[PDB]
Amino acid sequence: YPYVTGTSVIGIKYKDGILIAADMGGSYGSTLRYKSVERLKGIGKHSLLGASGEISDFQELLRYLDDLILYDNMWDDGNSFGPKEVHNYLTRVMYNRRNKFNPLWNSLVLGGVKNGQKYLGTVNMIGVHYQDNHVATGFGNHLAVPILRDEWKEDLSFEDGVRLLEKCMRVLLYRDRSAVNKLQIAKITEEGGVTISPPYSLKTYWEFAAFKNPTAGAEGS
Amino acid sequence: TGYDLSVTTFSPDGRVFQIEYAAKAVDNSGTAVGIKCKDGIVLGVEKLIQSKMMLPGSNRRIHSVHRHSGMAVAGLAADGRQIVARAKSEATNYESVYGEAVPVKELADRVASYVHLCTLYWWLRPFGCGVILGGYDRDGPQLYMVEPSGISYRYFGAAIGKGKQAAKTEIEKLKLSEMTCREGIIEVAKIIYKVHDEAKDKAFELEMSWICDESKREHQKVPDNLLQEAKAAATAALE
């Protein structure tokens, strides 16, 4: 069963690089046990992934990928895994562990840029995978892919990318009940490398007259 | 004589002749050198060539073993590759179990343990390569050297292969603690070139590697410009 689980991890391929956002919450049933669980990591030189779902399993996937990437690096023969190979390895491991009826309970968003070809893709807890311009997991797949599809552009700027991604993440924060206001945006680019935003919280709006007074009256509401 | 045909026999002198025969295999290979400098470790091997073709940059003998540590093999490079593979696997295992970088000391003891362990089995050929290990961790530089027998010790400077005697004599002259990286490069290159017997071999290739604060405490080949400068200095000194 999933015990300590996280939530949506949206993804948006923008000009000159890739952006991924994910709140810092790990919930335990209904409680938010944890509110500072960095759920985005940088993998190798050319990659970056976030995970949703069980946080123990995600921490294990990090060990798998760290051994993979260290073994890859120690060769020093001048070729390394780009986003594509890393994502394919992730799909293979997730599917294999599904075949054992012992799944890794996570949903993985992995993306990155290598040789000027920027890749972004996803993997499910049962091996379902696809590579796209913008991906999401969990409720980010209901409440964020509509707005991502609606507003994504071929050459989205970095600031426009951040503002779109925050639009999505705020829309989730309004209506997910599993999401904490803390969150991180991760930037990966060619020749800059991965760069993870410091944690922060988004301003939210509640002062609508209909909210203040459901119905309307001097006494009732 | 009958007492020199397996590794588990044990000679009337008191000696295990097969390990000496592996040592004799190491002694007649290209020289390897490691120096513990003030702020880091520099390794340098004498990868001698046999053909004009071997593309410069071929059978590397200085292998990374973990992000924080590297290794250099002498003798049968084929066996050195398995020692290096086992060192890699053990560092990885330590990370996976305890969750922190395997200390260099522990890694050296484990590699030496494995090399010895392969000396106990009747159905295993003993390893024919002894390695220098030059990790770098919260304890600073730590240079270890592992013999085929299994004996490993922490050194300030090591030297195996044909160049044993000359290399050790040249290193003894050297003020190891005062000299820093980018200075170990020149000293290693100079002594390697001095050791090289043109009357015995031809057109060798020089490798080097080092772990220090400059490399942010990781193992990585020398920036080739530094190697070129050091090789020039070594040639000038040899003149």
Curated annotation (Swiss-Prot), chain B:
Protein family according to the UniProt entry: Belongs to the peptidase T1A family.
Subunit architecture: The 26S proteasome consists of a 20S proteasome core and two 19S regulatory subunits. The 20S proteasome core is composed of 28 subunits that are arranged in four stacked rings, resulting in a barrel-shaped structure. The two end rings are each formed by seven alpha subunits, and the two central rings are each formed by seven beta subunits. The catalytic chamber with the active sites is on the inside of the barrel.
Matching InterPro entries: Ntn_hydrolases_N (IPR029055), Proteasome_alpha (IPR050115), Proteasome_alpha-type (IPR023332), Proteasome_asu_N (IPR000426), Proteasome_sua/b (IPR001353)
Statement: the UniProt record of this protein carries the keyword Nucleus: yes
PROSITE patterns: PROTEASOME_ALPHA_1, PROTEASOME_ALPHA_2
Protein name in the entry: Proteasome subunit alpha type-3
One GO BP annotation of this record: proteasome-mediated ubiquitin-dependent protein catabolic process
Organism: Spinacia oleracea
Compartments in which it is found: Cytoplasm; Nucleus
Keywords assigned: Cytoplasm, Nucleus, Proteasome
GO cellular component: cytoplasm; nucleus; proteasome core complex, alpha-subunit complex
Gene3D superfamilies reported for this sequence: Glutamine Phosphoribosylpyrophosphate, subunit 1, domain 1
Purpose: The proteasome is a multicatalytic proteinase complex which is characterized by its ability to cleave peptides with Arg, Phe, Tyr, Leu, and Glu adjacent to the leaving group at neutral or slightly basic pH. The proteasome has an ATP-dependent proteolytic activity.
